Each structure stands twice: as structure tokens, then as C-alpha cells.
From Swiss-Prot:
<dbReference type="GO" id="GO:0005737">
    <property type="term" value="C:cytoplasm"/>
</dbReference>
<dbReference type="GO" id="GO:0007204">
    <property type="term" value="P:positive regulation of cytosolic calcium ion concentration"/>
</dbReference>
<feature type="disulfide bond">
    <location>
        <begin position="742"/>
        <end position="753"/>
    </location>
</feature>
<feature type="topological domain" description="Extracellular">
    <location>
        <begin position="235"/>
        <end position="242"/>
    </location>
</feature>
<dbReference type="GO" id="GO:0086091">
    <property type="term" value="P:regulation of heart rate by cardiac conduction"/>
</dbReference>
<keyword id="KW-0407">Ion channel</keyword>
<dbReference type="GO" id="GO:0046872">
    <property type="term" value="F:metal ion binding"/>
</dbReference>
<keyword id="KW-0966">Cell projection</keyword>
<keyword id="KW-0107">Calcium channel</keyword>
<dbReference type="GO" id="GO:0098911">
    <property type="term" value="P:regulation of ventricular cardiac muscle cell action potential"/>
</dbReference>
<dbReference type="GO" id="GO:0098839">
    <property type="term" value="C:postsynaptic density membrane"/>
</dbReference>
<keyword id="KW-0813">Transport</keyword>
<dbReference type="GO" id="GO:0086002">
    <property type="term" value="P:cardiac muscle cell action potential involved in contraction"/>
</dbReference>
<feature type="short sequence motif" description="Selectivity filter of repeat III">
    <location>
        <begin position="797"/>
        <end position="800"/>
    </location>
</feature>
<feature type="transmembrane region" description="Helical; Name=S5 of repeat III">
    <location>
        <begin position="716"/>
        <end position="735"/>
    </location>
</feature>
<feature type="transmembrane region" description="Helical; Name=S6 of repeat IV">
    <location>
        <begin position="1112"/>
        <end position="1136"/>
    </location>
</feature>
<feature type="transmembrane region" description="Helical; Name=S2 of repeat I">
    <location>
        <begin position="42"/>
        <end position="62"/>
    </location>
</feature>
Length: 1261
């Protein structure tokens, strides 16, 4: 039977695997044991599949006697399938729920394709460096869960219950936590009473009652999805003073810092893989392919036209054709024609005038005829096949073929695909050829087409992952999202396309918590067995985001690096060609230092001044001080300019200072129409913070760097804008005037949807309510191109995109209402737009920033030998010294010191800290009195033990050596906050019990990997304090502008501008901007800031709803773009600062080995000094790590022979000093040289390396 196992038997089994995957898609999970005929057949087909994968595992089992992971998966799948079938037939715990193993069968499609197995291994092998970040995330989640347990435990269980009973939550359809008259949170007021006893904001799922519930809430907040909801619930529960310190800090630490770490590690790994695969020379094949194609058409056209110069009438037939295409006039004429085609395509809109629809149909045919004629003219003058040779010419040929195909229909339906004339806009991308960077865009496309095979493999593995998780979700939650609620969920797992859409939505991370809550309630509620189903959503989110990162960052980084290398090589070749061609043919106190400062302080004070204004109250005593305080502030800057204007006559920042001061001074007057002009020059007062530039060195540097980066990435921005415009045109064709709906679902026209109709509260037939029928459009529609660009932008931001998707799926016909699930196949448009724009273009932009930062800097060309290990080795050897030990004396201190400095004591206290953390982690809601007393006494016992440790280590280490390790002063401050915590506990303040949790960081700061990673990234963050000052300034400026513009809108609890979210205070405006930067409901806030809102009663006819502004669109879009750009800039700057650690190659010698050697050497020296023992070398050569020193070889051997053979410094037997022997060890480890090269190293170290300050007098020999 070992004969038929290598023939296409293995392809027969592969086809069997594909038909057990197209039978798990056809399956429809019906609610409550329902079925149909297709399922009745699929059972028998699965029986046949089970028979086949059994006698095929038997042959391999009785052929080779289960070791490989894939064959083990085969075996387990087969056995559980047989077990499930047998148990199902016998019973004809849940029986049918054991069929979830059948979704592992598609995982075998990569075991039969090694080409997919290699990319799977490449994706998997990048997980190992991220395990440290995973551990850090776990620790942060645990710490914040315990803090939330200690802060908000069981404080969100009271809602308004009305003053007639406790029937059910008579506070809107979305009840919120409240507080009593003795509380600080939200007050119900009017005919309501804040009565204790209530499930929770999300049916009791979102709260800090338990440690598991707190951990789930913390994870959901860290994923940045629905964290403002939790923050606002906490604000309503306990108050609006100190939950922002919790939630904002959690968001900053666990979402931005962690993302920075992940991006840095992934970029370092990708760079290492690139530098390892470049040695093979894969770039050469791409390099040699471009020049072979450049000379191809350059020689074929030479052959072509030489035939026409002749020796039938081609002399008067061919010269003009090739002299018109290359005339530079045909180029511009074709560009103008394409511009006209774009003009007529983009002029289409809903309810257009009847003349426009005729103009744009006549012009379409005319331009189609013209472009076909031009294509035919070019088709023969440059060879029929040589015309096909070119890249963009293939695009033109395909566009013409498709246009001719779709313009002759004129009888069939759905003419939306006829608008492939929009891809003709890609042909005008030759406008880059006239300008620069055309060799940077076309090189990118060439690299993409060269690597399309790996691109397809990477995109297919992601599709397989999505298919597997969609099948698993269809099995788990299929036909279960059917509860008694009146509204029907749209994101369900009922079908295969619906499951695919739901899994894609969860992968994008938008409203994934809603699907998680739906899945949790489908299995009961917040209970131990029911709520374990959230593991599916957690794993799906984490793994999908990780896979998307590893795919779309690898593609972008590799392709962009290849394109940049191609461009650099091409530039070098052009330089060499044009050089060799030329090498032959030719042959007043304002200039002070303290003043300046004092006035950059005033500038800071002036910036602080206008942030403290009152946005809403026009007249208030606080503004009396501030309004008259700016008067004296403006005088100082007015005096500053006059004192300077005499010195000279002008730069570009004195212009800005003048534009500030003159505007302020004229604004002091104005009078007359003090409504419009004042409201412009009052918001023009946001330029004062910008005066810190040119007055604070470093701010100017970072601003100039950001401007250079903008100028570099403008090409990618332009290409993304072009693609967005094309997709907007396609969407306008698809959904023009189709996204209208009526409040009454029974009317499908505007004329019908008129008058009143009866609604029922919660669908209770006994409670009818009259409401008016209204013909409404979608929030973001596709009526015209401008209305579609913004809808696509909001889709790309992953904000409210499922709502638009499910609104577009129902649309069927212009001017008519929706139909449930009319065109589910239209979701491919949104999927493709998200993949191309929100996933590929964004990662291309980030990789472009990374590459343009990497090719800057390191290209300083430090070509004074000394490659990228030895400079660091030499500087470390120069900057080194023996360390201290402090070995107790008093012969009594030694005993306690030995006790406290052992490893067993350290491990014992680590276990004690773990036990204390576990004790803190089980403070549930509704605990009994015995539990509380036991917890109190256990906390007392732990704090006593830790005081005992502290006393032991003041003695052992003395009161000077204790407060020397910074881990000790932090420990000292922690426990003293626990001793006096018990003092105030028996007779409150919640701040003092948070010190116990903070002690868990000692466990985190014990592994050499996480410690080094965190330390290096923190140092890189500290070393760049202005890249974050840029974000701070942007936030401040936009907060002030929002306060001035939208600061008067009313706080309506049913609108997105309310008590928790508003512009009425600088902290509140900053919090709103932070929430928008996270991207929570920024589109909803923008729509709530549009003009026509009744607003603040405390500001003072014809003004019914006169406030608001149409500036909101630009405000909220520009803020999003600028915030994303600046955050990416900061991330890449930190990554490039820390890039040395991210690409380390730990196998080779590194500074960590030097640190270990120093820590081994430290104990043998009583002081720093530099005096050693001659016999100490015996243990020195044995204690060194073999990669750093020598292995398990005998001491008195060639190791000692070479140690003594080297010319040591002319010292005594043991008076040689530490840096000398360190340099000797580093030079013997690597970069070895023959005798007589000492002077070469001596002269080299004083040229490129830092100054020695004549401190190497004894190190010369
Ligand atoms: C309150 C929070 C405040 C905490 C401040 C506590 C400070 C404790 C004292 C620290 C002393 C400073 C030294 C220190 O410990 O810093 C780091 C680790 O610490 C963290 O990053 C610690 C990272 C902790 C971050 C997790 C925080 C998450 C929870 C926050 C909750 C906040 C709750 C707020 C909610 C409020 C509710 C209202 C270690 O410092 P290190 O210098 O010893 O580590 C080095 C480093 O790795 C070097 O590369 C290398 O030596 P050098 O080059 O000579 O330095 C050695 O490693 P290699 O040779 O392998 O390279 C190590 O020796
Ligand atoms: C990059 C730079 C920006 C990053 C974004 C960080 C987020 C900033 C969050 C700070 C504002 C959060 C909201 C807030 O502080 O709430 C307002 C609160 C008082 O709220 P109030 O409406 O007066 O409620 C009365 C009932 N107590 O106000 C207060 O009482 C606290 C205000 C403190 C302001 C913080 C400044 C630090 C000093
Ligand atoms: C899809 C991959 C990860 C393999 C499948 C693993 C999961 C989906 C499988 C393996 C173990 C299975 C569970 C084993 C036991 C029980 C308890 C029973 O009362 C209901 C079914 C239930 C709850 C099964 C549901 C499906 C299950 C959780
Ligand atoms: C040539 C390309 C790049 C740009 C094309 C711009 C022109 C054709 C487009 C862009 C925005 C369009 C407008 C968008 C919306 C409106 C409002 C309404 O009254 C219908 C027509 C009108 C006024 C459109 C007319 C055509 C329009 C002005
Ligand atoms: C996502 C995959 C790859 C890994 C996670 C496995 C998931 C799907 C498995 C592991 C544990 C499982 C749960 C274990 C126990 C129960 C309780 C039972 O009364 C209903 C099913 C339920 C709630 C299971 C649902 C499926 C489950 C959550
Ligand atoms: C580094 C720089 C940008 C920090 C700037 C901080 C300034 C703008 C912040 C910090 C503290 C803030 C104040 C904190 C509290 C209040 C009380 C509130 O009822 C009105 C606003 C007011 C009076 C704030 C005004 C703005 C303020 C002074
Ligand atoms: C790593 C571990 C030890 C951390 C802490 C987890 C344990 C101790 C936590 C998590 C889940 C918790 C339980 C979950 C639900 C309830 C129901 C409630 O009415 C009484 C407490 C009780 C029974 C909790 C007791 C403590 C508990 C068992
Ligand atoms: C500089 C960041 O701008 C964005 O956040 C973009 C989003 C939203 O960010 C994508 C988050 N996934 N949506 C659209 C479509 C974009 C646009 O209109 O380009 C002009 C920009 C963008 C701009 C330049 C380069 C890339 C991108 Cl993605
Ligand atoms: C704003 O709040 C008031 C207070 O009850 C309410 O009457 C009004 O309807 C709200 N505005 C809107 C648009 O609903
Ligand atoms: Ca969201």
C-alpha cells in the first residue's frame, strides 16, 4: 500500500478537502433544530467525506506505523469526526456542538501546498519576538483590572426607576447609571428616583464587579473600541472628576505605547529578513529585468522606423505617426481629453438637469470614439506586439476593450459596470512623467507586479483564516442571534456570506464588542459557562489584527524598499552616464539670551491665557480678568517688535509675529459690526503658540523635519486621493439616489411616505404611539461625487461603516425604499475599498515614512572602517569601570546581608508578591462579611511581612545603600503607604489602597528581554521631547478653535454634544479631541456640530437656532489627518531612534555580554580603583560566556597562551586597569590583527571615535 501514496492520490485528497469546504458553506444553521432538504443531503455527503478521510489515514497509519503536526491534525480530525458521527447516530453533551472540529479541515489546504506552508511559517516565526510585548500587555491588563476592581466595584447598579414603582428602567430605552442625593454622579431629577438594583449598562456584562469582568472591560477599552462608553458610565456612576486619569492613561499606555512597540519590533524583524535575503541577490533579478525592458523598446523602435525609411507607400505613411506621438503635443491633447472625460464622468449626480444627462451621454460616445481612434493609430505605428509590450499600454487596451463591450449594451440592465471609463483617469497619471518622482511611482508598480505571486499567497492565507473563523462562528452562533427584541441584528452568523461579513467587521475592529455581547447573550448571559464564549471573539480579534499587520506591513515595506533601491541604482547609472559623456566632449538688546527667554515665557503665559476663557458665557468675571490681561500681554510683544524693528529692515517669522500683533491690536478696536469680523480675528488668536518656533531651538528643527516628510510623502497622498476619487465615482454610479428610506417600513416612495403612522413601544401591541412619516436619506450617501468622497473617507476610518454597508445592501432602485438583503453581492465594493485603501495604502504610507527615515541618518557614510559593532564596542570599552559591591563588615551585618542577598529570599518574596496579588484579585461584588474580614487580616499580614523585609534591608544595606537602588525608594514609598493605610482603615480615601497593585512591576522588571525593551524605548521617548510637543501644540490649537466655534451648542443627552462630550471647557475640548483621535464617533460629533442647533440658554428674538457652523467638516477631517500623520511621525521617529536594539543579531557579540562580564568582574574589586589580582584571570577565563569568551576548554591551554601572548599594557602583576583588559578581550573576540598594528588602532581611535581626553596614557601599550 506504500505504492499508491505518491500518484495523484494526494491531489484526489486535496479535491476532497475542497469539497468538504464547499459543503460547510452551503449548510444553513437553522434556529431550534429546523432543517431543509439541502441539509438532509449534506449529512450523507459528510458521511462519505468521513469514509474517505478514514481510509487514507489508515493507509498512512499502516504504511509508516503520527509525529508531524499536520499528520497528527489529520488523525485527530478523523477520530473526532468518527466519534461525533457515532455518538450522533447513537443519540438519534450537546451532540451537534461537537461538529466544530469539521472547520479545521480547510487548514489542510496549506499542508498539501508547501508554497503556502512556507508563507505560513514566515508569518508564524514573527510571533516569537512579540511574546515580550504580549506579556507586557497581559501585565498591564491585570494591573488595570485590579485597579478598576478597587475603584469601581459594584458602583454601576442603580438607574432611574420613576416615582410609581420599580417596573422596568423608566429612563429612556438606554438606561444609564445614576447616583443618590448623597452621591456625586448623575442625578435623575423630575419624576424619577435613583433606586438601587439594576442589571447593568450592557445586561450586566460591562462593569468592574468581578476580576474576570474587569479584565474583559479593560481589554475592550485597550482595543480602543467603545471605551468612551465605559468612561461615561463611570462618570455617571461615581462622578466626572477622576475617571479620566484612569481611562486616558490606560488608552495611552496599552494602545499607543504597545502599538509603537509592536511596529518597532515588526519593522526590525522585516529589516533583518530583508538584509538576510539581499545577500542571495533577489534584487539583482528585479534590477536586471528593468534595463532589459528599457533597451527592448529602444531597439525595437529603431528596427521599426528604419524599415519605414525604406530602401507599400510607407514614406508618406509612417513618419508623422511616430513624430506625432513623440511631438509633445499629442501628449497634452490626450491629457486634455482625459481631463474632459473625468469632467463628464464626475459631473453625474442625483436629480441632474435633463440637458446634462444628454450632454454627458453624447460626450461619452465622442470621447470613446476619439480614444479608440487614437489607440488604433498607435497600434500599428509602434508594432502590434511592441505596443502590447508596454505596461500602461496594456491598461489602455483593456480599458478600450471593456468600454467597447459595455457601450454597445444599450438594451440590458445594470449599466453601473459601464463606467469603467473612470480607470481612464489612471492614464493621466503620466503627468508624473513631466514632473519628478515618476521613477518612484512606476518603480513601485514594477515591484508590485514582480512580487504579485507572494502578494497573492499572503492574501490567500488571510482569506483561509477568515473562512475558517467564519465557519467556526457559523457553527457556534448560527441561528442563535434570534431574541425577542423588536430590532433584528444585521451582523449575524446565519449564512456563509453573512458570517464572512461579520468576521471581516470584527477584523476591522468596528463594533466588535456589540457582536461579542450578542454572542454572550445567545448562550445565556453573564455566567461562568455562558460568558466563556468571548474567547472566540478575543482570539479572532488578536490573531486577525496580527495577521493583517504581518501581511500588509511586510508587503509595503519589502516593495517600497525594493523600489527605493531601484531608484537609487537608476540615479547612480544616470549620473555615471552624464558624467562620462561630459568627461569626453568637454576635453539693540533683542539679540540677548535671557531676554529672549523671558519673552518665550510670556508667550507661554499668553497661550495659557486664552485656554482659560469661557466659551459659552459671553460676560463672566473670569473673562473680565483675562480680557484685560491680554492688554498688558499685547503691550510686551508690541514693545518687543519696536525694540527689534530698528535693528533691521525681513525673515518669515517676524512676518508671523507682525500678523499676530497687528491683528490683536486692530481687534482691540473694530467696533461697528462687532458680529462677523470679530468672530474671525478672535479665532485668528490661535497663532500665538506658533511663535515658540524660531524662539525655541529644536521646535524649528522638528517642524522643518515634518515639512520635509510632507514634501516626501505628497506623492503617496496624491495617489491615494486619486484612488479615493475613482472609488467615489464608482460608488456614485452604484448607489445614486438609492439610499433613501421612510420611517414607516411599509411605504417605498416619497409620495406614499406622508402623514402619520402608528408605532408601538418595544413592540407592545397594547402601547401604540403616533409618529410622523418622514422620507429620510442616509447619513452618508452617494448622491454625487463630493457626497461620496466623504462617505468613503468615513468608511476608511472604520467609523459607522457597517451601517452604510447594510444600508447599501438593501438599496435596489432609485427613488424607492429598501428591500431586506436585496444585493448582498454589493459588499464586495466595500471589501475591496477597505483592502486597497484602508489596509494597503495606509501601510504603504507608514512603510514609506519608515524607509525615508531609515535612508536618512544612517547614510551619514561613516566609512572610517569600524563597522556597526566595533564602534559601540570601543566606546563601551572606553566608558567602563569596575562596579561596587558593598560587602558588609561588623561581622554581624554580614549574616543579615547574606540572608537578604541570596536568590532564595528573592524568590520567596516574589512568591509572596504573587500571593498578595491573587488575594487582591478576588474582591468580588456582594462578598460576605467573613470574606472581607479575612481579606483585611491577610492584607495586614502581607504588609507586616513587607515591613519585615524593609527593616532587614536597611540593616543589611545600611541607610545609605538602601536609598541607592531606585527600585528601593519606590518600594519604600509603596509600603509606607500601606502601613498608614491600615491606620485610616479601622475608622474615607480610595487613593491609598492602590499602592499594593503597583508592587507587581518588580516581577515585570526581571526578564532581560522586557526590561531592555522597555528601557530602550523609554530612553528613545525621552530623547525626542519635541516630536510629542508637536502633537501637544496641535491638540491645544484645535481645542481652542473648537472652544471658540462649537463652544455654545446645547448639551442634549440624546445628541453627541452632552454633559460628557462637549466643547464648553478646555479639558472637555481636549478630551473630545482625544476621543476623535481614537476614532470613536467622530462622524457623529461632526454631524452634531453642523449649523441649525438650539443652544446655550445662558448666552444672549430672531435667534431660534442660529449657532453651529459648517466649518465642522473641515475641522473634524483636518484634525483626523493631522493627528494620524503626527502620531505616525512620532512612532517612526522613536523606532528609528531605537533601531539599533531592534536589529541586534544577539548571536554575535553585543553590549549585553559586556554588561554580564562587568557584573561578574565587579565583586572581585573592593573599590573602583583599577587594581586586580594576577590569579583572578584563572576564574575570569572560566566565568566568561563562550560567545563572549571561551567555552568549556581547560584553563591552562591555548586560551591562557593567547591571553599572555598579547602585548598587555606595561603595568605590574595586577595593576592593569579594567578598560585595558576589556579592550584586549574585545579585540581578541573579534577584529583581530597581527602584531605591529597597535599604532593603527591608536591613531584610528582619536580620529572618528570620541575624544579620549588624554585618559589612555596607560592604555597605549
Ligand atoms: C505608578 C506607576 C509609576 C511607576 C514608577 C516606578 C518606578 C520604579 C523604579 C524604577 C527604577 C528605574 C530603573 C528601572 O527599573 O527601569 C527599567 C525597568 O523599569 C520599567 O520600565 C518600569 C515599567 C513599568 C510600566 C508599567 C505600568 C503599567 C501600569 C501603570 C498603572 C497606572 C495607574 C494609574 C491609574 C490611576 C487611577 C486614578 C530597568 O532599568 P535598568 O537600567 O536596570 O535596565 C537595564 C536596561 O535593560 C539596559 O539596557 C541594561 O543596562 P544599562 O544599559 O546599564 O541600563 C540592562 O539590560 P541589558 O544589559 O539586557 O540591556 C538593564 O540593567
Ligand atoms: C496630547 C495632549 C492631549 C492628550 C489628551 C489627554 C486627555 C485629557 C483629559 C482631561 C479632561 C478630561 C475631562 C475632565 O477633566 O472632566 C472635567 C472635570 C470636571 O468636570 P465638570 O463638568 O466640572 O463636572 C462637575 C462634577 N464634578 O475637570 C476637572 O475637574 C479636572 C480637570 C483637569 C485638567 C487636566 C490638567 C492637568 C493639571
Ligand atoms: C475550531 C478549532 C479551534 C477546534 C474546535 C475547538 C472548539 C470549537 C470545540 C472543542 C471542544 C468543544 C466543546 C466540548 C464540550 C462541550 C460541552 C457541551 O455541553 C456542549 C459542547 C461543548 C461546549 C463543545 C463545543 C465545541 C468545542 C469548544
Ligand atoms: C475634473 C475633476 C478632477 C473635478 C470635477 C469637478 C466637478 C465636475 C464636480 C465636483 C463637485 C460637483 C458638484 C457636487 C454637488 C453638487 C450639488 C448639486 O447642486 C448638484 C451639482 C453639484 C454642484 C456638483 C456639480 C459637479 C461638480 C462641481
Ligand atoms: C477561537 C478558537 C480558535 C479558540 C477558542 C475556542 C472557543 C471557540 C471555545 C473554547 C471554550 C468553549 C466554550 C466552553 C464551554 C461553554 C459552555 C456551554 O454551556 C456552551 C458553550 C461554551 C460557551 C463553549 C463555546 C466555545 C468555546 C468558547
Ligand atoms: C504643555 C501645555 C500645552 C499645557 C497647557 C495647560 C493649560 C492650557 C491648562 C492646564 C490646567 C487647565 C485649567 C484646569 C482647570 C480649569 C477649571 C475649569 O472650570 C476651566 C478651565 C481651567 C481653568 C483650565 C484652563 C486651562 C489649563 C490652565
Ligand atoms: C488567578 C485567579 C486566582 C485570580 C482571581 C480569580 C478568582 C479568584 C475569581 C474570578 C471569578 C470569581 C467568581 C465569579 C463569580 C462569583 C459570583 C458572586 O456572586 C460571588 C463571587 C464569585 C463566586 C467570584 C469569586 C472570585 C472568583 C472565583
Ligand atoms: C494622513 C492620514 O490620512 C488618513 O487618515 C486617510 C484616511 C483614513 O485613514 C486610514 C485608516 N485606515 N482616509 C483616506 C481615504 C485618506 C485620503 O483621503 O487620502 C488623501 C487618508 C490618507 C491620506 C494620505 C495617505 C494615506 C491615507 Cl490612507
Ligand atoms: C434638547 O433637550 C430638551 C430638554 O428636554 C428637549 O426637549 C429637546 O427635544 C432636545 N432636543 C432635541 C433636538 O431633541
Ligand atoms: Ca469604532
Amino acid at each position: 500500500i506504500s505504492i499508491v501514496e505518491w500518484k495523484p492520490f494526494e491531489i484526489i485528497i486535496l479535491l476532497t478537502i475542497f469539497a468538504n469546504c464547499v459543503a460547510l458553506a452551503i449548510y444553513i444553521p437553522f434556529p431550534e433544530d429546523d432543517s431543509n432538504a439541502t441539509n438532509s443531503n449534506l449529512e450523507r455527503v459528510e458521511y462519505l467525506f468521513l469514509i474517505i478521510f478514514t481510509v487514507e489515514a489508515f493507509l498512512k497509519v499502516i504504511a509508516y506505523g503520527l509525529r508531524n503536526g499536520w499528520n497528527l491534525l489529520d488523525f485527530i480530525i478523523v477520530v473526532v469526526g468518527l466519534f461525533s458521527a457515532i455518538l450522533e447516530q447513537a443519540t438519534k453533551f450537546d451532540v451537534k456542538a461537537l461538529r466544530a472540529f469539521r472547520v479545521l479541515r480547510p487548514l489542510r489546504l496549506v499542508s498539501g501546498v508547501p508554497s503556502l506552508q512556507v508563507v505560513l511559517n514566515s508569518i508564524i516565526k514573527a510571533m516569537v519576538p512579540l511574546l515580550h510585548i504580549a506579556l507586557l500587555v497581559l501585565f498591564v491588563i491585570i494591573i488595570y483590572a485590579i485597579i478598576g476592581l478597587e475603584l469601581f466595584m459594584g458602583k454601576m447598579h442603580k438607574t432611574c426607576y420613576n416615582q410609581e414603582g420599580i417596573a422596568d428602567v423608566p429612563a429612556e430605552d438606554d438606561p444609564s447609571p445614576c447616583a443618590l442625593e448623597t452621591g456625586h454622579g448623575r442625578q435623575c431629577q423630575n419624576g424619577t428616583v435613583c433606586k438601587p438594583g439594576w442589571d447593568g449598562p450592557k445586561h450586566g456584562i460591562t462593569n468592574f464587579d468581578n476580576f474576570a469582568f474587569a479584565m474583559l472591560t479593560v481589554f475592550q477599552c485597550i482595543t480602543m473600541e467603545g471605551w468612551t462608553d465605559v468612561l461615561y458610565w463611570v462618570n455617571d456612576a461615581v462622578g466626572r472628576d477622576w475617571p479620566w486619569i484612569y481611562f486616558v492613561t490606560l488608552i495611552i499606555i496599552g494602545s499607543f505605547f504597545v502599538l509603537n512597540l509592536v511596529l518597532g519590533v515588526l519593522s526590525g524583524e522585516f529589516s533583518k529578513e530583508r538584509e538576510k535575503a539581499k545577500a542571495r541577490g533577489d534584487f539583482q533579478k528585479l534590477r536586471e529585468k528593468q534595463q532589459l525592458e528599457e533597451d527592448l523598446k529602444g531597439y525595437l523602435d529603431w528596427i521599426t522606423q528604419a524599415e519605414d525609411i525604406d530602401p507599400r507607400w510607407n514614406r508618406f505613411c509612417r513618419r508623422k505617426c511616430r513624430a506625432a506621438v513623440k511631438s509633445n503635443v499629442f501628449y497634452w491633447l490626450v491629457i486634455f481629453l482625459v481631463f474632459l472625460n473625468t469632467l463628464t464622468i464626475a459631473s453625474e449626480h442625483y436629480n441632474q438637469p435633463n440637458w446634462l444627462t444628454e450632454v454627458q451621454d453624447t460626450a461619452n460616445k465622442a470621447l470613446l470614439a476619439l480614444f479608440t481612434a487614437e489607440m488604433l493609430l498607435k497600434m500599428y505605428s509602434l508594432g502590434l506586439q511592441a505596443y502590447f509590450v508596454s505596461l500602461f499600454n496594456r491598461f489602455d487596451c483593456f480599458v478600450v476593450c471593456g468600454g467597447i463591450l459595455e457601450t454597445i449594451l444599450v438594451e440590458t440592465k445594470i449599466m453601473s459596470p459601464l463606467g469603467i471609463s473612470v480607470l481612464r483617469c489612471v492614464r493621466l497619471l503620466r503627468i508624473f512623467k513631466i514632473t519628478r518622482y515618476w521613477n518612484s511611482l512606476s518603480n513601485l508598480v514594477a515591484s508590485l507586479l514582480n512580487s504579485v505571486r507572494s502578494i497573492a499567497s499572503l492574501l490567500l492565507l488571510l482569506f483561509l483564516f477568515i473562512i475558517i473563523f467564519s465557519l467556526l462562528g457559523m457553527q457556534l452562533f448560527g441561528g442563535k442571534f434570534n431574541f425577542d427584541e423588536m430590532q433584528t441584528r444585521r451582523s449575524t452568523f446565519d449564512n456563509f456570506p453573512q458570517s464572512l461579513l461579520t468576521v471581516f467587521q470584527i477584523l476591522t475592529g468596528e463594533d466588535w464588542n456589540s457582536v461579542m455581547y450578542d454572542g454572550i447573550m445567545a448562550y445565556g448571559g453573564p455566567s461562568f459557562p455562558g460568558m466563556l464564549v468571548c474567547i472566540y471573539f478575543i482570539i479572532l480579534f488578536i490573531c486577525g489584527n496580527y495577521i493583517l499587520l504581518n501581511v500588509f506591513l511586510a508587503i509595503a515595506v519589502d516593495n517600497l524598499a525594493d523600489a527605493e533601491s531601484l531608484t537609487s541604482a537608476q540615479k547612480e547609472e544616470e549620473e555615471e552616464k552624464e558624467r562620462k559623456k561630459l568627461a569626453r566632449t568637454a576635453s539693540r538688546i533683542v539679540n540677548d539670551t535671557i531676554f529672549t527667554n523671558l519673552i518665550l515665557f510670556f508667550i507661554l503665559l499668553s497661550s495659557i491665557s486664552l485656554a482659560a476663557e469661557d466659551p459659552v458665557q459671553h460676560t463672566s468675571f473670569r473673562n473680565h480678568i483675562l480680557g484685560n490681561a491680554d492688554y498688558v500681554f499685547t503691550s510686551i510683544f508690541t514693545l518687543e517688535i519696536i525694540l527689534k524693528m530698528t535693528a533691521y529692515g525681513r525673515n518669515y517669522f517676524n512676518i508671523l509675529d507682525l500678523l499676530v500683533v497687528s491683528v490683536s491690536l486692530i481687534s482691540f478696536g473694530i467696533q461697528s459690526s462687532a458680529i462677523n469680523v470679530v468672530k474671525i480675528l478672535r479665532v485668528l488668536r490661535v497663532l500665538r503658540p506658533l511663535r515658540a518656533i524660531n524662539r525655541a531651538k529644536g521646535l524649528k528643527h522638528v517642524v522643518q523635519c515634518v515639512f520635509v516628510a510632507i514634501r516626501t510623502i505628497g506623492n503617496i497622498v496624491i495617489v491615494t486621493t486619486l484612488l479615493q476619487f475613482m472609488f467615489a465615482c464608482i460608488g456614485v454610479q452604484l448607489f445614486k439616489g438609492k439610499l433613501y428610506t421612510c420611517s414607516d417600513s411599509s411605504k417605498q416612495t416619497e409620495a406614499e411616505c406622508k402623514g402619520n403612522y402608528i408605532t408601538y413601544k418595544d413592540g407592545e401591541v397594547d402601547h401604540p404611539i403616533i409618529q410622523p412619516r418622514s422620507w429620510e436619506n442616509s447619513k452618508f450617501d452617494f448622491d454625487n461625487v463630493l457626497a461620496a468622497m466623504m462617505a468613503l473617507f468615513t468608511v476608511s476610518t472604520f467609523e459607522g461603516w457597517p451601517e452604510l454597508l447594510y444600508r447599501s445592501i438593501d438599496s435596489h432602485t432609485e427613488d424607492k425604499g429598501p428591500i431586506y438583503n436585496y444585493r448582498v453581492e454589493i459588499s464586495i465594493f466595500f471589501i475591496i475599498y477597505i483592502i486597497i485603501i484602508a489596509f494597503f495604502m495606509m501601510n504603504i504610507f507608514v512603510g514609506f515614512v519608515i524607509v525615508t527615515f531609515q535612508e536618512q541618518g544612517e547614510q551619514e557614510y561613516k566609512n572610517c572602517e569600524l563597522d556597526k559593532n566595533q564602534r559601540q564596542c570601543v566606546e563601551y570599552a572606553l566608558k567602563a569601570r569596575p562596579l561596587r559591591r558593598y560587602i558588609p563588615k561588623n561581622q554581624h551585618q554580614y549574616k543579615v546581608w547574606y540572608v537578604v542577598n541570596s536568590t532564595y529570599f528573592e524568590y520567596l518574596m516574589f512568591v509572596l508578591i504573587l500571593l498578595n496579588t491573587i488575594c487582591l484579585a478576588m474582591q468580588h461584588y456582594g462578598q460576605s462579611c467573613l470574606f472581607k474580614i479575612a481579606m483585611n487580616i491577610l492584607n495586614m499580614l502581607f504588609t507586616g511581612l513587607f515591613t519585615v523585609e524593609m527593616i532587614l534591608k536597611l540593616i543589611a544595606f545600611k541607610p545609605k545603600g538602601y536609598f541607592s537602588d531606585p527600585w528601593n525608594v519606590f518600594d519604600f514609598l509603596i509600603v509606607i503607604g500601606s502601613i498608614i493605610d491600615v491606620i485610616l482603615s479601622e475608622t474615607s480615601i480610595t487613593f491609598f489602597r492602590l499602592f499594593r497593585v503597583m508592587r507587581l512591576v518588580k516581577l515585570l522588571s526581571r526578564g532581560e528581554g522586557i526590561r531592555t525593551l522597555l528601557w530602550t524605548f523609554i530612553k528613545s521617548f525621552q530623547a525626542l521631547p519635541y516630536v510629542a510637543l508637536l502633537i501637544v501644540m496641535l491638540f491645544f490649537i484645535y481645542a481652542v478653535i473648537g472652544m471658540q466655534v462649537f463652544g455654545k451648542i446645547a448639551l442634549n443627552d440624546t445628541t453627541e454634544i452632552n454633559r460628557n462630550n462637549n466643547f464648553q471647557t478646555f479639558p472637555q475640548a481636549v478630551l473630545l479631541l482625544f476621543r476623535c483621535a481614537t476614532g470613536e464617533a467622530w462622524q457623529d460629533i461632526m454631524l452634531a456640530c453642523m449649523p441649525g442647533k438650539k443652544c446655550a440658554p445662558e448666552s444672549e428674538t430672531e435667534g431660534e437656532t442660529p449657532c453651529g457652523s459648517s466649518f465642522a467638516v473641515f475641522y473634524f477631517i483636518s484634525f483626523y489627518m493631522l493627528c494620524a500623520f503626527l502620531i505616525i511621525n512620532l512612532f517612526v521617529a522613536v523606532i528609528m531612534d531605537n533601531f539599533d536594539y531592534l536589529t541586534r543579531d544577539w548571536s554575535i557579540l553585543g553590549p549585553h555580554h559586556l554588561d554580564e562580564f562587568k557584573r561578574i568582574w565587579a565583586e572581585y574589586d573592593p573599590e573602583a580603583k583599577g587594581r586586580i589580582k594576577h590569579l583572578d584571570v584563572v576564574t575570569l577565563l572560566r566565568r566568561i560566556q563562550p560567545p563572549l569568551g571561551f567555552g568549556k576548554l581547560c584553563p591552562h591551554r591555548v586560551a591562557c597562551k593567547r591571553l599572555v601572548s598579547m602585548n598587555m599594557p606595561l603595568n605590574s602583576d595586577g595593576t592593569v586597569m579594567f578598560n585595558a583588559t576589556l579592550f584586549a578581550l574585545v579585540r581578541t573576540a573579534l577584529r583581530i590583527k597581527t602584531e605591529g598594528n597597535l599604532e593603527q588602532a591608536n591613531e584610528e581611535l582619536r580620529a572618528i571615535i570620541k575624544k579620549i581626553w588624554k585618559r589612555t596614557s596607560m592604555k597605549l601599550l
